[PDB]
Every structure is written in C-alpha cells, then in structure tokens.
Amino acid sequence: KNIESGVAHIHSTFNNTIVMITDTHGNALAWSSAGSLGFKGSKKSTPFAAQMAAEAATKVAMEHGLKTVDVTVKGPGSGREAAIRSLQATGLEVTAIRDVTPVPHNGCRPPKRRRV
RNA sequence: GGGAGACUUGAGUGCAGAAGAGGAGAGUGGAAUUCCAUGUGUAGCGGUGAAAUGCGUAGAUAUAUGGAGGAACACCAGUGGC
C-alpha cells in the first residue's frame, strides 16, 4: 500500500488520455481516464480531461502513500503538459521525463487514410 | 560501290585503379504491431462531425517480464547512387 515512488504512464491519444501510476518494477498502483472522470464525445481529448485524470489518480495514489514519480510519455495529443503540471500541483515531484513513443522502424502496414 | 592493301582517331582487348539500395542464393539481426503465458490493477476501452456496432466484470484497456509468428527495414537518406 504505502510506497515511496513509482512511474507516471500517460497514454495520450486523439480520443482519450489514460494516466496510470505504477511501481518501478511494473505492478500498478493507480489509474484513471477521461471517461472514468465522466467525460464524453470530444471532451475526452482535452487537456482539462487529462488534468482531472491526473488529479484523481494522484489523489488515490497519495492516499496509498508515495511522494515522487518518473514520467513515461507515450502517444499524440495535448494532455501531456496539463497532466504533468497537475502532477506537480497535486504533489508528486516530477523526478524526470522520457517519451517512449514507439518508432515502428518500418515494421507494420498502417491502415488506409480516412478518405478514398 | 567491287577488289588488293596500309594507318589509327572510332569500336574493342590488355595493365592499374574507383564507386556502387546492380542482380541471384544462403543465413542473421534490433524496433514496432498481433497473439500466448505470468503477475499488478479494475471499469470502462475503442471509435466519431455526432454517435453507435464492437470489446470488457468470465478481469478489458493499460502496465512490467518472457515466448511464438509473419512482414518491413527508423536515423544515415539527398532534383544522391546502380
């Protein structure tokens, strides 16, 4: 329950952001998202929704007990900045940041465009 | 134009060097996806102009450690090269 620090996994996309706080070896400690907060439609894709997600997840995580986190960013979208600022505000000192945006190295065929 | 020649500039051979996703055969790789397994954790995930179909409480998404399988080769990479 009570631990020292973990990680911040922030899977931001065009439709939703999903914040997940985990221990350094992996086993999770909290998570939340815009739909969890109660957002709908395009509101899920918002920095405010990412902010509220980080708020709720940090509240639960601090209720368990911790102080600081590393930040593992992944994906497009603009919730990154607002969510990180809200981590700082709700208390978790942002130890460090790194993006792990997967580079396919030309690995897979992506689907067609949204026309033709 | 025909025939008998002669010559080396054209064409080619030889000496020595240069470059190169040039081609065929063989194997090998790291990244990423998908799936499978093990844990964490639990209510939404995904998607849209809006939604909805779908998937998910039988443990989803996500997260961390491996494994299987296929395909394509980030940077270099450029009206650059063959």
Helices and strands in order, then pairings?
Blueprint: E1 5-12, E2 17-22, E3 28-33, H1 34-37, H2 47-64, E4 68-74, H3 79-90, E5 93-99
Parallel strand pairs: 1-4, 4-5
Antiparallel strand pairs: 1-2, 2-3
This protein binds one RNA strand of 82 nucleotides through β1, β2 and β3.
PDB class: ribosome
Keywords: Antibiotic resistance element, ribosomal protein, LsaA, abcf, target protection, antibiotic resistance, ribosome
Entry title: LsaA, an antibiotic resistance ABCF, in complex with 70S ribosome from Enterococcus faecalis
Could you describe the 3D structure shown?
This is part of a larger assembly, with one chain. The N and C termini lie far apart (52 Å). The longest helix has 18 residues. Helix content is 29%, strand content 29%. A five-stranded mixed sheet has the order 3-2-1-4-5. Helix 2 runs parallel beside helix 3. Strand 4, helix 3 and strand 5 form a beta-alpha-beta unit. The protein is an alpha/beta fold and 116 residues long. The protein binds one RNA strand of 82 nucleotides through strand 1, strand 2 and strand 3. The PDB classes it as ribosome.
